[PDB]
Amino acid sequence: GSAMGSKPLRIGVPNRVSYTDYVSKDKNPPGVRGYCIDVFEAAIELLPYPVPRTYILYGDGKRNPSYDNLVNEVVADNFDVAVGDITIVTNRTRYVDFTQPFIESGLVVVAPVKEAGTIEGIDSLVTSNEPIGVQDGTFARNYLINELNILPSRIVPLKDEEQYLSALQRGPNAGGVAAIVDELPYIEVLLTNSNCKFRTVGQEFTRTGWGFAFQRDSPLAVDMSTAILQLSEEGELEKIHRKWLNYKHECS
Amino acid sequence: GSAMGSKPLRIGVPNRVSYTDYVSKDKNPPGVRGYCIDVFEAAIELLPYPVPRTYILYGDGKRNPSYDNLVNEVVADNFDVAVGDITIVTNRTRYVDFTQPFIESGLVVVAPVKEAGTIEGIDSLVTSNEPIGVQDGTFARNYLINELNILPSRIVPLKDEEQYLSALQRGPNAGGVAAIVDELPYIEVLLTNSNCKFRTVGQEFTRTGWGFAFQRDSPLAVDMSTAILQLSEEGELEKIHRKWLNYKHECS
Ligand code: MET
Ligand code: MET
Ligand code: NA
Ligand code: NA
Ligand code: NA
Ligand code: NA
C-alpha cells in the first residue's frame, strides 16, 4: 500500500493568560485544556469519521494573543482551525467558516457600584470621555473605536484580573479607568472574584457567540455545527460549562 | 448578447397563522411581511452584488406548516432558501447551510400562575404525565418525544393564540393541557396577550436560534452571515425587532 500518511488537523489555540478556565495551556498532553477544548473534543467524538489532530498554542504566554491574528493564521493556512473562545466577529466571517456558536456572548460595561450614578451603560460611558479598560488581544478594542466612536487614546489594554481590578479601583482620575468593556463570559468570572465592589451597568449592548473557526468551504465546519447542536440537546454543553465555570461567591 | 436571463432566488416563506408579526402573508407585494422578512431584506441590501429574488408562500394558511417539510423543500431544490422563523435544529443542519443566527431562541414551559406549585419546569412537566400543548408545524413535538422522553399521545397540537389560551385555561383534567412548550419569542407575544394568568416556569431548557436556511455549499449563506453580523453591530436587528414586536401590556 501507499506509505505517505495524511496530515493531521492543525488546531491553533490561544495561549490565554487571564480567564484560563475557558482555554489555556496544560503541562500534560494534549498540551491544552479548558471549557472550549472539552466542547471541541466532545464535538469531534460525534463526527462520523476519525479526525487525527494536534493542538498548537498561539501566543508568547505573557499577554493574551491577538485573536484577529490567530484567525488570520487559519486564513493563511498555518492552522486548519482556531479553537478557543473565538468571537464570531463581522470581519472574521469574511474569511473563515465558523461553526454555529457553542456559547452566547456579548459586550457589557463593568464599573464600581459607587460609580453607577455617572456610568450607567455604554451611552454614558461614551459621553463621559473617560478611559475604558479592555483585555489584550480582543476584538472589543476596534469594536469600540469603529462602532461606538471611542477615541483610540481612551482605550487602555490590561493584562490579567489583578490589573482589571486595580484599574477599576484607581478609577478614571487616578491612572485607572471609568469602566471595563468586555464580553459577559469573562465578566461573570471577574465578578465571581471581586467581592461585590463592581457590577455590570446597563444592557448587554451587543449579541454574538463563540465558534470554532475553520477554513472557507470546510466540510468539518458543517459536521461540527451538527455536533455542537447534538451536544446542546444532550445537555452536554451545560455539563461541560458546569465542570469548568462556577460564578457563585461569598458576598452574594 | 445572450437572451436567456438568470433564474431569481426562490425564497420559501412559512404561511404562519399564529404569531404573524414574525413572518406572514401580505396582500401587497412582495406578498410577505414581518420581522424575519425585514431582517432578510436588510441583509440582502448589504451584499456586494444584486440578488434578484421572489417570495413563495408555503402552507395552506389554515394551520402553520411543517417547518421540517419547508426545510426539506430547500434540500429537494424546490426553493433556494427558507426565510422566516426557522429554528436551527440538529437534523436540519445535516442537509442545509444555515446562516449564523439572527435571533436567539430556546424552549420554555408556560403554565397558569395557579399551577406553578405542581408544574415548575420541564422536569416536573415530564414526570406529571399530563398533556402538553405545542404549535402546529414546530420542531418541538419531535424534540419533546426524542430528547425529553414524552409519550407521543401526551402532545396536543393547537392552532392559534385563542386555542393556546383556551387549552391552558381548561387545564389537564378538563380536555386542555398542563403546560405549553414553545420557543421564547412566541411565548413573549402570548404573555403580552393573556392578562397575567400564565407565566414561564423554570429555566429556558434549550438554546438555539433562528437562521435563514440555504442549500448546502451556498456562497449566499456565507455572505448573509457577514451581513447579519453587520446588522447586529449597526443596531438594525434591534431597530427591526422594535418595529414589529412589543411585549409591554396593561397588567405588568
Ligand atoms: C483575548 S480576549 C478575548 C478575545 C475575544 N473572545 C475575541 O475573539 O476577540
Ligand atoms: C410553526 S411553529 C414554529 C416553528 C419553529 N420555529 C421551527 O422552526 O420548527
Ligand atoms: Na480540557
Ligand atoms: Na453569531
Ligand atoms: Na415586512
Ligand atoms: Na445555533
Side-chain angles (χ1 to χ4, degrees):
Chain A
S2 190
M4 176 67 64
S6 57
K7 307 148 300 302
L9 188 71
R10 299 167 296 159
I11 302 167
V13 178
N15 192 4
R16 286 195 65 77
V17 304
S18 74
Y19 302 119
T20 57
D21 286 327
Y22 285 113
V23 56
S24 57
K25 69 154 142 51
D26 185 351
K27 40 160 205 143
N28 300 325
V32 296
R33 61 193 313 257
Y35 170 77
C36 300
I37 302 304
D38 278 8
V39 173
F40 189 81
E41 280 288 331
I44 289 287
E45 187 273 321
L46 293 166
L47 301 173
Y49 41 81
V51 183
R53 66 192 167 284
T54 192
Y55 295 88
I56 306 171
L57 284 165
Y58 185 79
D60 54 21
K62 298 176 201 305
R63 291 180 171 276
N64 295 319
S66 165
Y67 280 48
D68 283 349
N69 291 355
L70 169 55
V71 173
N72 226 53
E73 289 296 317
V74 175
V75 179
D77 196 33
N78 292 329
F79 302 128
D80 295 307
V81 58
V83 167
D85 53 327
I86 319 300
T87 308
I88 304 168
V89 187
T90 310
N91 197 59
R92 295 174 187 174
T93 68
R94 293 186 167 94
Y95 303 99
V96 295
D97 275 359
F98 281 99
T99 63
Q100 291 292 315
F102 60 88
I103 189 178
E104 295 154 9
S105 197
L107 293 176
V108 300
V109 177
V110 172
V113 165
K114 277 160 169 202
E115 207 194 25
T118 60
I119 303 296
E120 57 256 17
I122 187 60
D123 293 343
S124 50
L125 182 61
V126 171
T127 61
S128 81
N129 291 325
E130 293 175 337
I132 303 170
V134 295
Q135 295 196 53
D136 289 315
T138 180
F139 86 98
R141 175 171 151 79
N142 288 333
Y143 193 95
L144 281 176
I145 294 171
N146 292 318
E147 301 302 326
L148 273 306
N149 199 28
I150 301 306
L151 187 73
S153 52
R154 291 174 61 186
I155 299 166
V156 179
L158 297 167
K159 193 154 74 116
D160 55 25
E161 287 194 67
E162 186 180 324
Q163 291 195 4
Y164 308 145
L165 296 176
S166 72
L168 282 165
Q169 270 287 339
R170 293 173 178 143
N173 298 300
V177 301
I180 288 173
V181 166
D182 207 357
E183 294 168 83
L184 186 50
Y186 311 115
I187 291 314
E188 286 165 337
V189 177
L190 189 62
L191 295 178
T192 303
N193 294 337
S194 46
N195 201 201
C196 295
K197 300 298 208 213
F198 312 114
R199 48 172 294 186
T200 61
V201 292
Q203 298 313 290
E204 182 162 11
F205 61 90
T206 75
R207 305 262 160 180
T208 182
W210 302 340
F212 304 122
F214 289 92
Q215 296 187 349
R216 183 55 33 86
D217 303 320
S218 172
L220 265 184
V222 169
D223 291 338
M224 287 289 278
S225 289
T226 301
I228 288 160
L229 277 45
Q230 291 174 285
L231 295 174
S232 195
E233 79 197 1
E234 284 161 9
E236 280 300 321
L237 294 185
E238 207 187 295
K239 178 166 166 190
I240 298 159
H241 201 279
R242 284 191 321 269
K243 172 177 164 189
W244 284 100
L245 284 330
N246 191 294
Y247 310 138
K248 311 281 190 175
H249 61 310
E250 179 204 322
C251 79
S252 189
Chain B
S2 190
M4 176 67 64
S6 57
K7 307 148 300 302
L9 188 71
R10 299 167 296 159
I11 302 167
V13 178
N15 192 4
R16 286 195 65 77
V17 304
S18 74
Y19 302 119
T20 57
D21 286 327
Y22 285 113
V23 56
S24 57
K25 69 154 142 51
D26 185 351
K27 40 160 205 143
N28 300 325
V32 296
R33 61 193 313 257
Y35 170 77
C36 300
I37 302 304
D38 278 8
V39 173
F40 189 81
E41 280 288 331
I44 289 287
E45 187 273 321
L46 293 166
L47 301 173
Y49 41 81
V51 183
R53 66 192 167 284
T54 192
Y55 295 88
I56 306 171
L57 284 165
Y58 185 79
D60 54 21
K62 298 176 201 305
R63 291 180 171 276
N64 295 319
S66 165
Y67 280 48
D68 283 349
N69 291 355
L70 169 55
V71 173
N72 226 53
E73 289 296 317
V74 175
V75 179
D77 196 33
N78 292 329
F79 302 128
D80 295 307
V81 58
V83 167
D85 53 327
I86 319 300
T87 308
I88 304 168
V89 187
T90 310
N91 197 59
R92 295 174 187 174
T93 68
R94 293 186 167 94
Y95 303 99
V96 295
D97 275 359
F98 281 99
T99 64
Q100 291 292 315
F102 60 88
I103 189 178
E104 295 154 9
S105 197
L107 293 176
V108 300
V109 177
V110 172
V113 165
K114 277 160 169 202
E115 207 194 25
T118 60
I119 303 296
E120 57 256 17
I122 187 60
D123 293 343
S124 50
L125 182 61
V126 171
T127 61
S128 81
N129 291 325
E130 293 175 337
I132 303 170
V134 295
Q135 295 196 53
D136 289 315
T138 180
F139 86 98
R141 175 171 151 79
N142 288 333
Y143 193 95
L144 281 176
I145 294 171
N146 292 318
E147 301 302 326
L148 273 306
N149 199 28
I150 301 306
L151 187 73
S153 52
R154 291 174 61 186
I155 299 166
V156 179
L158 297 167
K159 193 154 74 116
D160 55 25
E161 287 194 67
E162 186 180 324
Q163 291 195 4
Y164 308 145
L165 296 176
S166 72
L168 282 165
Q169 270 287 339
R170 293 173 178 143
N173 298 300
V177 301
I180 288 173
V181 166
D182 207 357
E183 294 168 83
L184 186 50
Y186 311 115
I187 291 314
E188 286 165 337
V189 177
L190 189 62
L191 295 178
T192 303
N193 294 337
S194 46
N195 201 201
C196 295
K197 300 298 208 213
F198 312 114
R199 48 172 294 186
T200 61
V201 292
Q203 298 313 290
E204 182 162 11
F205 61 90
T206 75
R207 305 262 160 180
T208 182
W210 302 340
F212 304 122
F214 289 92
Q215 296 187 349
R216 183 55 33 86
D217 303 320
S218 172
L220 265 184
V222 169
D223 291 338
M224 287 289 278
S225 289
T226 301
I228 288 160
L229 277 45
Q230 291 174 285
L231 295 174
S232 195
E233 79 197 1
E234 284 161 9
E236 280 300 321
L237 294 185
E238 207 187 295
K239 178 166 166 190
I240 298 159
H241 201 279
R242 284 191 321 269
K243 172 177 164 189
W244 284 100
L245 284 330
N246 191 294
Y247 310 138
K248 311 281 190 175
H249 61 311
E250 179 204 322
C251 79
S252 189

